[PDB]
Design a protein around this ligand. Structure first.
Ligand SMILES: CCCCCCCCCCCCCCCCCC(=O)OC[C@H](COP(=O)([O-])OCC(O)COP(=O)([O-])OC[C@@H](COC(=O)CCCCCCCCCCCCCCCCC)OC(=O)CCCCCCCCCCCCCCCCC)OC(=O)CCCCCCCCCCCCCCCCC
Ligand SMILES: CCCCCCCCCCCCCCCCCC(=O)OC[C@H](COP(=O)([O-])OCC(O)COP(=O)([O-])OC[C@@H](COC(=O)CCCCCCCCCCCCCCCCC)OC(=O)CCCCCCCCCCCCCCCCC)OC(=O)CCCCCCCCCCCCCCCCC
Ligand SMILES: CCCCCCCCCCCCCCCCCC(=O)O[C@@H](COC(=O)CCCCCCCCCCCCCCC)COP(=O)(O)OCC[N+](C)(C)C
Ligand SMILES: CCCCCCCCCCCCCCCCCCCC(=O)O[C@H](COC(=O)CCCCCCCCCCCCCC)COP(=O)(O)OCCN
Ligand SMILES: CCCCCCCCCCCCCCCCCCCC(=O)O[C@H](COC(=O)CCCCCCCCCCCCCC)COP(=O)(O)OCCN
Ligand SMILES: CCCCCCCCCCCCCCCCCCCC(=O)O[C@H](COC(=O)CCCCCCCCCCCCCC)COP(=O)(O)OCCN
Ligand SMILES: CCCCCCCCCCCCCCCCCCCC(=O)O[C@H](COC(=O)CCCCCCCCCCCCCC)COP(=O)(O)OCCN
Ligand SMILES: CCCCCCCCCCCCCCCCCCCC(=O)O[C@H](COC(=O)CCCCCCCCCCCCCC)COP(=O)(O)OCCN
Lengths: 205, 438, 77, 97, 155, 127, 111, 147, 82, 58
């Protein structure tokens, strides 16, 4: 409007609908659909199955962290001097404990997420928040004062961030095209494509 | 319009060719020429053209410039207030930085392209880092604060502009586009949230103002805060009205909370500049809420209140600077007896403080009345909340005035001829707007 | 440089000594007391809010009762 | 302490100033100094009174042009001598005067 | 009501013709239109020319409404000042008209979030009349006052 | 002598200042004062808040006793020995409109119930 | 011991070598106080003495969160009343779960 | 005490300057003070601004600077038409019944009768009648009252 | 003299704590070799990993960030003992 | 298990400890300052007060 007399923006009729018009005459899709593996892992029906399918990721991350710390300890120890102690006995707890703690935290998160979703019966943000909060509570069992408040918050926030930018964002902005005519405005006289642009072939790596 | 833009481009250009001894005189003459060109732009703006008074394009969508009600008022305010900043600053380096900042800000107001708007407003990012972080009187902390807050907000705005340019195909305001996306609305909103200080993103402002030179503080409070209202009216409400209506309870919560917490924080301040900075933060909340109502009464009220603030806050910052030059202190506790020792400084200080409290003969009164009417149009409780909490501003202002007004002082610290010359235009403008020539 | 920290005792005989000091500890209200007084005073401040809530509730309840009775009268008849 | 050279330009203490009261004479205030009584006050006051009467004349002209009486006075009003827009007086009974 | 793409493009072509006809002769009052461009678009933003022209018409109308309200207020104030103590009976009509003008001006372009301006308490009085009718017919007891003959000088 | 009277100057600060020293108002004259008198330090008359509350507790019932009777115990019929002022029908109907009027309490009138409901009007605007 | 630096005639020169102190702008500066300066420093740098304690968490949550909650609840109530007043269908707000798509009233439509 | 010579109307006892304005010391011989470098530029630029603003506000034709000024004659004409129309409406009770029907379909209360009369030429009514939202009876009613 | 921030701790104790970083420093090539080798094998293996939910991925990233130990931390605390 | 939580500088203890000795502003001396917390007291009708104030003939 760019005036001071009437409200800015506009209004669209709710009664009047515009019949959908295809973006192009022929649509070629270079985006592959989700794999059967993805759907299997995503299935939260059985909490135990869901947990056991998704823990490998947490275990791997714990193993990488433990390997990192163990290597740092091993690198410093001197080869030239003989050591009374056994290095593996010193280093094995590091890796084992890190992997176990990571797996336990990821198990708690996955279990609570599946159990809440089943009990509630709906896929919602709350399920992620309560799983994160429970994981952060387990993380901060014996930590000083600030940490009990901070970790349940950071952990609860992480599934919120994942849901907003991993699931809601793409579905929200699926229609936008970028070529031909703007999604909403097809009356405007813009070049109309016979086929959609294919910027890349479907990936295979 | 073309004359104004040309004068704007000539002012930074003139410095390159000046003698390095005539710099201040040339800069003052250029500032006055830019003011006169702005008056010419006002003369060549016919009210008959209701939508945009004038639009000029120089070969691309980025170079599309135009003036509307908000743009016209803000541009005239910037041109009116720049001469004061110029005279208050000494040195070629300082002049160069100030003139570049002013050119970037004044070009941003008239820009009608979101990407061009971003290019022009954020160009003056290092210059503020360098200005607020000057060798002896500056603070690196304040510079880092303002720079990081600006970069993060403007980057979010840039991402939203890129999506709008990809989806619609253009990002120019003159092309009617509507979006219901909440991510894009949030991206555009975050810039407004930070630039116009709103709790909890207001921390950058007080630090910058305290450690900025008087010319910098005057420019910042006078017009830099207003750049948010141009972005709202020109780049947010036309496209993202649906999201402002969807989030109105949240917008109202954040704006009222900003007004309350800022008012309470002003009570614990012992530095005059911090008091003026927190007063500005409190005042910005009404403008933001009034514009978000998307009503005629609100948009006009917000712009009017912005002009009133852009006339009252530079005055207080100027008087504070004059006092600091005379005394080398900003602590209210050290400053006493100012009534007896500086009757002329005191009179102007009291007048400006009365203006800040929105008394009837000041522009703030009319502006507040209009903004409150817009809130009352939305809901009666909305207006009542804002009206009631206004007493907190009175408590802090009264306490400050009382501490400054009386006591024992052995130093005559009054304004010189130069100091009266610098505030006289601001006083006259305040009086004229107060009597209803808004 | 800095101001002198030495006081003036010229008027001490006339107006009394400065020996007596304040007894205040310069600390604020307790957290428990503050919670009570904030949650007491703020509702008093927001008197219009409660009046609006009261009237709106009464109106909505009346309207719902009217609808219920209307339904009942429109069922049999 | 030897009074500074400029002290000659400054005015003395007025008659109304209490002898004990000491004030700095260098400070300027628009409302006047501590006890004022400047020389030439009589002329300044005469000029002030003339500006007051001239402004009163202008205000009277403006008011007379803008004073709108839409209902007849009950009886004769002084405004009739100077303003011609007064409706003819009507009494309580209703009789025109 | 559905709008097919063929009809939408047809209207777009007609709009372009309207713009071309307007462009042929210079008009100083181009942005103060006396008539809107009639349309059945779902969103006005679809046709930019229609959107801008209609917005300018709406601004013109609102300015006219504001000035009309000021005129109505002036006649009400004159009427009130002339009658004296008979103002309540004689100035009911003028006041009614002024209040109607105020409602028209405020309500037409209130905005997305603004409430309707109930000048004269007409909506409240109507609501109370409906509530009374319902309570009386259904045998309920009304906790609200009954509707009033006059609630303001006019409405 | 109103002007030029001797004053005692407050001693310069010579010890570390408390964090909340802004609660003290000192202009440089010797008797500085709290920001709000009675917030801390000596209390006027040596009377605490508890003493004032106990006083108000003793006083409040005696002051409220006249008002509670007429407003609550008494009724329109019994408050006064006469009816409200009687007016011609045209005058009375207009006067009855005013919520803050005095003709709404006329029990003798056949419109008493409506007038009473009008007097106890709406708390807030419905629209 | 003092001299007038300023010259109205314009023949101003800074006598940097003058035995007598110039009465320049520095003449009127107020003398600072060692304790006041330390108070100013302590007040500004109050983040150093910040400690996370249950009392601090309680006070913050009760006043800041409490006000924010009260303000949100009031705004939601006012929005609900306005929607009922205007006659508009329940609007789809951000956190409200409404099976209605209404957001902006149609100007053409009569509600 | 009292007055200096016992008379209220006597010359003031103070000769000299009550204070120094701006802190400037009077030149001994009465030489004028040298003007500051900025005084001429400042006075010209700001005076030119204020004078230009005055001339634009007052000199410009109606509707150039203040848009409301343009609308005032038109509002007077519409006021005249509306007044005549409302007078006709009060007299004819048949038209009132028809409008009561039109109002109900438009979700408007009976009191909003004058409001409908006053919106004859407005975006909502003009586009609603064309689209079908507003009953076509309104057009005839408006014509019966000389539009 | 100016007001300055109070430094917690005694001077000699803080210096002693700082001196615990002055230890034989390994070359970074040894760490880099292993990271390059395992990283190459990891990238080859990653192509075959099952597709994980975004939420699980983000949680794994959080856990890895929390469990990551900075090289300086091990360096300061490393003791050649059982 | 070593975690960021161990090495994050949590704000659990004050970095700066305010000076113990604190300035108390000079105040006029009130000889007797005990607060009266009892509205009804025997002190008001004390025998001393009756002899000193109530009884002497005026
Ligand atoms: C045809 C007929 C003829 C008619 C004329 C028409 C011709 C048209 C244009 C011709 C004019 C000449 C151009 C000037 C070139 C040199 C300028 C310069 O060096 O600046 C400082 C210089 C002052 O020199 P100095 O005081 O003697 O000391 C400098 C020493 O060399 C070193 O001193 P130092 O080491 O102490 O550094 C301290 C530094 C403090 O440190 C910093 O702050 C560093 C910050 C980094 C850059 C600042 C970032 C923000 C800058 C924003 C841009 C400003 C405009 C804002 C408008 C928004 C535009 C989007 O502070 C400064 O240097 C000044 C602060 C502000 C100046 C920054 C603006 C300069 C931007 C780039 C300059 C161009 C260089 C190109 C090089 C060419 C070959 C080498 O010149 C000035 O007077 C001020 C700057 C004038 C800016 C106009 C230049 C145009 C740049 C705008 C970009 C738009 C695109 C270009 C199109 C222009 C029209 C086509
Ligand atoms: C047997 C050989 C031993 C090695 C074992 C394995 C060998 C490698 C095999 C395969 C390697 C490929 C994959 C491994 C990770 C990729 C990194 C890499 O290889 O670069 C070469 C790297 C050395 O490169 P460099 O350039 O020489 O060192 C640069 C640093 O400055 C180094 O200097 P610095 O260590 O002294 O400084 C560390 C600095 C470096 O900064 C980083 O680490 C940046 C990494 C941040 C995120 C990385 C991207 C995350 C995306 C992951 C993508 C997958 C998920 C998909 C979606 C997730 C969306 C984010 O970060 C810190 O300051 C410590 C904090 C840790 C992260 C900071 C973020 C904290 C956020 C948490 C918030 C909670 C606080 C709230 C309360 C706060 C109170 C106010 O080698 C390794 O570190 C490999 C060690 C493997 C341990 C990784 C632990 C988990 C791995 C996956 C989790 C993903 C997060 C990454 C966390 C840490 C990774 C460094
Ligand atoms: C219950 C409230 C019902 C009505 C509320 C109206 C007034 C409430 C409190 C009045 C405070 C205003 C008094 C004041 O400003 O004067 C103080 C100045 O005090 C201050 O500035 C402190 C700030 C107080 C202002 C606000 C505090 C009370 C706020 C009310 C509720 C708090 C929060 C509720 C919502 C924000 C000076 O103190 P005195 O020593 O008494 O001066 C008198 C002169 N003499 C020396 C001769 C005795
Ligand atoms: C940058 C975003 C990160 C959030 C920052 C918040 C502050 C961090 C503090 C950590 C707290 C954990 C994160 C909580 C934020 C979510 C908001 C809570 C609201 C809420 O609980 O409603 C849920 C939906 O909100 C939602 O989950 C969607 C709301 C989106 C979050 C807010 C987006 C804007 C915030 C940005 C403010 C400033 C940015 C700077 C960080 C439930 O929904 P439901 O569907 O489950 O219904 C229930 C049916 N069972
Ligand atoms: C998928 C991702 C999942 C989430 C993962 C998040 C992980 C981290 C994300 C954080 C990104 C924010 C970037 C800002 C970091 C804070 C600033 C750094 C702190 C700092 O010490 O900066 C110093 C001064 O900064 C200052 O003075 C600035 C003060 C603080 C700036 C406030 C930040 C701006 C507002 C924040 C959000 C606003 C809206 C958010 C949408 C300069 O340090 P140095 O130069 O001396 O370096 C020496 C090394 N120590
Ligand atoms: C917790 C209180 C919220 C704090 C914000 C207070 C006031 C901010 C209002 C700003 C006004 C316009 C912004 C539009 C929405 C922003 C926040 C609205 C509240 C919100 O989070 O709603 C969510 C949807 O918004 C979204 O999905 C987007 C959320 C924002 C994204 C965060 C960062 C985005 C940055 C992207 C940069 C540019 C990207 C451009 C491509 C979920 O609500 P729901 O509808 O699901 O209800 C389910 C509950 N049961
Ligand atoms: C960790 C962070 C937080 C932890 C600590 C938080 C503790 C705060 C909890 C209480 C805070 C105040 C209470 C407000 C929320 C109460 C419960 C919310 C549910 C709710 O909306 O009920 C409404 C409350 O009344 C209302 O509409 C609001 C009444 C109270 C507002 C006025 C009170 C103070 C006034 C001060 C000014 C603030 C507002 C200024 C505008 C009335 O129910 P409904 O009829 O709306 O039905 C709507 C369906 N539930
Ligand atoms: C003899 C010499 C006299 C010496 C001192 C007198 C100085 C001028 C006195 C009268 C001149 C008044 C003009 C000042 C501003 C009035 C602007 C104005 O109201 O008109 C607006 C023009 O639009 C615009 O956009 C105008 C923009 C420019 C206005 C100034 C912007 C602020 C600049 C700095 C403030 C100093 C102002 C002086 C539209 O008015 P409307 O459409 O809202 O309807 C009007 C009802 N409100």
């Amino acid at each position: 409007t760019f005036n001071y007399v009437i409200p800015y923006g506009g209004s669209s009729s709710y009664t009047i609908n515009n019949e959908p018009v295809k973006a192009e005459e022929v649509t070629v899709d270079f985006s592959k659909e989700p794999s059967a593996s993805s759907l299997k892992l995503a299935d939260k029906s059985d909490w135990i199955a869901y947990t056991f399918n998704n823990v490998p990721l947490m275990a791997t991350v714990g193993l990488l962290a433990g390997a990192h710390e163990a290597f740092l300890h091993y690198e410093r120890t001197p080869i030239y001097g003989k050591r009374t102690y056994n290095i593996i006995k010193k280093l094995a707890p590091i890796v084992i404990n890190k992997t176990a703690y990571a797996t336990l935290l990821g198990a708690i998160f996955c279990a609570t997420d599946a159990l809440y979703e089943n009990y509630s019966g709906k896929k919602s943000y709350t399920s992620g928040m309560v799983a994160g909060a429970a994981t952060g509570a387990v993380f901060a069992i014996g930590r000083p004062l600030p940490q009990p408040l901070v970790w349940p918050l950071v952990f609860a926030a992480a599934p919120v961030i994942a849901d907003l930018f991993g699931e809601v964002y793409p579905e929200s902005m699926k229609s936008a095209r970028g070529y031909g005519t703007p999604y909403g405005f097809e009356n405007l006289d813009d070049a109309v494509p016979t086929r959609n642009p294919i910027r890349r072939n479907p990936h295979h790596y | 319009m073309s004359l104004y833009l040309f004068m704007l481009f000539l002012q930074p250009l003139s410095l390159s060719f000046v003698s390095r001894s005539f710099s201040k005189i040339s800069s003052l003459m250029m500032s006055f020429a830019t003011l006169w060109s702005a008056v010419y732009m006002w003369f060549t703006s016919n009210g008959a053209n209701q939508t945009f008074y004038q639009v000029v394009s120089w070969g691309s969508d980025w170079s599309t410039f135009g003036v509307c009600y908000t743009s016209l008022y803000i541009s005239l305010l910037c041109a009116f207030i720049f001469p004061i900043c110029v005279i208050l600053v000494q040195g070629y380096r300082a002049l160069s930085i100030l003139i570049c900042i002013q050119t970037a800000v004044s070009l941003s107001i008239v820009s009608l392209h979101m990407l061009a708007f971003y290019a022009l407003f954020e160009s003056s990012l290092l210059l503020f880092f360098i200005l607020i972080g000057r060798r002896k009187y500056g603070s690196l902390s304040a510079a880092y604060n303002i720079s990081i807050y600006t970069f993060i907000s403007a980057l979010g705005f840039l991402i939203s502009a890129f999506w709008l340019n990809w989806s619609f195909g253009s990002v120019c305001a003159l092309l009617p586009n509507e979006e219901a996306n909440s991510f894009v609305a949030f991206g555009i909103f975050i810039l407004l949230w930070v630039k116009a200080p709103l709790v909890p993103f207001h921390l950058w402002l007080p630090e910058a103002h305290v450690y900025a030179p008087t010319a910098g503080s005057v420019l910042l409070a006078g017009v830099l805060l207003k750049i948010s209202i141009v972005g709202l009216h020109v780049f947010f409400l036309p496209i993202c009205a649906s999201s402002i209506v969807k989030a109105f309870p949240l917008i109202l919560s954040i704006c009222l909370g900003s007004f309350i917490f800022s008012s309470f924080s002003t009570l614990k301040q012992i530095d005059l500049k911090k008091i003026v900075a927190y007063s500005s933060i409190s005042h910005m909340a009404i403008v933001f809420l009034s514009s978000a109502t998307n009503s005629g009464l609100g948009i006009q009220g917000a712009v009017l209140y912005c002009i009133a603030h852009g006339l009252i806050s530079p005055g207080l910052f100027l008087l504070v600077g004059i006092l600091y030059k005379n005394t080398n202190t900003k602590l209210v506790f050290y400053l006493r007896g100012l009534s007896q020792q500086a009757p002329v400084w005191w009179s102007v200080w009291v007048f400006f403080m009365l203006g800040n409290l929105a008394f009837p003969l000041f522009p703030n009164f009319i502006a507040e009345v209009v903004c409150l009417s817009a809130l009352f149009k939305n809901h009666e409780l909305y207006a009542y909340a804002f009206i009631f909490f206004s007493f907190v501003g009175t408590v802090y202002s009264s306490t400050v005035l009382g501490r400054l007004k009386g006591g024992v002082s052995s130093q005559c610290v009054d304004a010189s001829r130069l100091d009266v010359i610098s505030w006289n235009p601001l006083v006259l403008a305040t009086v004229v707007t107060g009597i209803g020539y808004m | 440089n800095y101001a002198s920290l030495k006081a003036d005792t010229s008027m001490d005989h006339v107006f009394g000594d400065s020996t007596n000091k304040l007894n205040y500890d310069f600390q604020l209200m307790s957290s428990k007391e503050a919670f009570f007084w904030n949650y007491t005073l703020y509702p008093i401040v927001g008197f219009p809010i409660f009046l609006y809530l009261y009237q709106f509730n009464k109106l909505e309840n009346f309207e719902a009762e009217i609808a219920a009775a209307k339904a009942a009268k429109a069922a049999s008849e | 302490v030897p009074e500074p050279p400029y002290a000659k330009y400054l005015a003395n203490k007025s008659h109304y100033c209490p002898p004990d009261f000491h004030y700095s004479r260098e400070i300027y205030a628009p409302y006047g100094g501590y006890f004022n009584d400047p020389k030439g006050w009589r002329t300044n006051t005469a000029i002030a009174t003339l500006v007051m009467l001239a402004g009163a004349y202008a205000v009277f002209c403006f008011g007379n042009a803008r004073e709108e009486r839409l209902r007849a006075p009950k009886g004769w009003i002084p405004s009739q001598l100077w303003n011609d827009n007064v409706p003819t007086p009507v009494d309580y009974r209703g009789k025109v005067l | 009501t559905t709008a097919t793409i063929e009809e939408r493009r047809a209207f777009h072509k007609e709009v372009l013709d309207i713009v071309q006809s307007k462009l042929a002769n210079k008009n100083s009052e181009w942005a103060r239109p006396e008539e809107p461009i009639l349309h059945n678009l779902k969103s006005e933003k679809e046709e930019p020319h229609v959107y801008y022209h209609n917005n300018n018409f709406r601004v013109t109308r609102q300015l006219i409404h504001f000035e009309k309200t000021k005129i109505f207020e002036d006649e009400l104030d004159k009427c009130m000042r002339t009658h004296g103590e008979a103002k309540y009976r004689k100035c009911q009509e003028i006041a009614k008209r002024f209040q109607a003008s105020c409602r028209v001006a405020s309500n037409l372009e209130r905005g997305p979030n603004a409430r309707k301006r109930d000048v004269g308490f007409i909506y409240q009085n109507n609501k109370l009349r409906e509530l009374e009718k319902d309570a009386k017919e259904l045998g309920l007891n009304n906790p609200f006052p009954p509707s009033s003959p006059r609630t303001t000088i006019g409405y | 002598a109103g002007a030029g009277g001797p004053v005692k100057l407050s001693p310069p600060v010579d010890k570390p200042l408390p964090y909340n020293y802004d609660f003290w108002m000192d202009n440089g004259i010797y008797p500085g004062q709290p920001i709000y008198d009675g917030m801390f330090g000596s209390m006027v008359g040596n009377m605490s808040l508890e003493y004032m509350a106990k006083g108000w507790l003793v006083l409040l019932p005696i002051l409220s006793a006249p008002f509670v009777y007429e407003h609550c115990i008494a009724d329109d019929v019994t408050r006064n020995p006469f009816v409200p002022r009687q007016y011609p029908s045209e005058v009375r109907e207009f006067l009855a409109l005013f919520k803050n009027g005095f003709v709404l309490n006329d029990y003798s009138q056949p419109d008493y119930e409506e007038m009473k409901r009008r007097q106890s009007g709406l708390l807030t605007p419905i629209y | 011991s003092s001299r007038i630096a300023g010259d109205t005639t314009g023949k101003y020169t800074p006598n940097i070598f003058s035995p007598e102190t110039p009465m320049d702008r520095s003449f009127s500066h107020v003398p600072k106080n060692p304790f006041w300066e330390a108070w100013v420093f302590r007040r500004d740098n109050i983040q150093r003495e910040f400690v996370w304690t249950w009392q601090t968490i309680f006070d913050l949550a009760t006043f800041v969160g409490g006000l924010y909650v009260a303000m949100y609840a009031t705004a939601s109530f006012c929005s609900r009343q306005n929607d009922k007043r205007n006659g508009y269908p329940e609007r789809n707000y951000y956190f409200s779960d409404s099976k209605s798509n209404f957001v902006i009233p149609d100007e053409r439509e009569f509600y | 005490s009292g007055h200096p010579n016992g008379s209220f109307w006597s010359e003031g006892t103070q000769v000299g300057l009550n204070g120094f304005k701006y802190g400037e010391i009077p030149l001994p011989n009465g030489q004028p003070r040298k003007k500051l470098w900025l005084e001429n530029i400042w006075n010209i630029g700001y005076g030119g601004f204020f004078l230009g603003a005055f001339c634009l506000y007052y000199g410009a034709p109606p509707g150039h600077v203040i848009p409301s000024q343009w609308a005032t004659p038109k509002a007077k004409d519409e006021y005249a038409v509306d007044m005549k129309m409302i007078d006709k409406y009060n007299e004819r009770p048949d038209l009132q019944a028809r409008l009561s029907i039109v109002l109900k379909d438009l979700n408007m209360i009976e009191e909003e009768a004058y409001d409908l009369i006053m919106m004859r030429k407005d975006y909502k009514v003009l586009l609603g009648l064309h689209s079908g939202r507003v009953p076509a009876d309104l057009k005839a009613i408006y014509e019966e009252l000389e539009a | 003299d100016e007001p300055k921030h109070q430094i917690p701790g005694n001077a000699l104790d803080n210096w002693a704590f700082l001196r615990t970083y002055a230890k034989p420093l390994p070359d970074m090539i040894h760490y880099y070799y292993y990271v390059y080798l395992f990283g190459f094998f990891f990238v080859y293996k990653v192509a075959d990993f099952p597709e994980y939910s975004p939420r699980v991925l983000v949680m794994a990233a959080l856990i890895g960030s929390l469990f990551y130990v900075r090289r300086d931390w091990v360096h300061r605390e490393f003791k050649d003992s059982p | 298990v070593k975690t960021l939580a161990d090495y994050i500088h949590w704000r659990n203890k004050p970095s700066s400890i305010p000076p113990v000795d604190e300035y108390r502003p000079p105040v006029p001396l009130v000889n007797y300052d005990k607060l009266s917390t009892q509205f009804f007291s025997k002190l008001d009708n004390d025998p001393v007060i009756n002899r000193v104030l109530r009884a002497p003939k005026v």
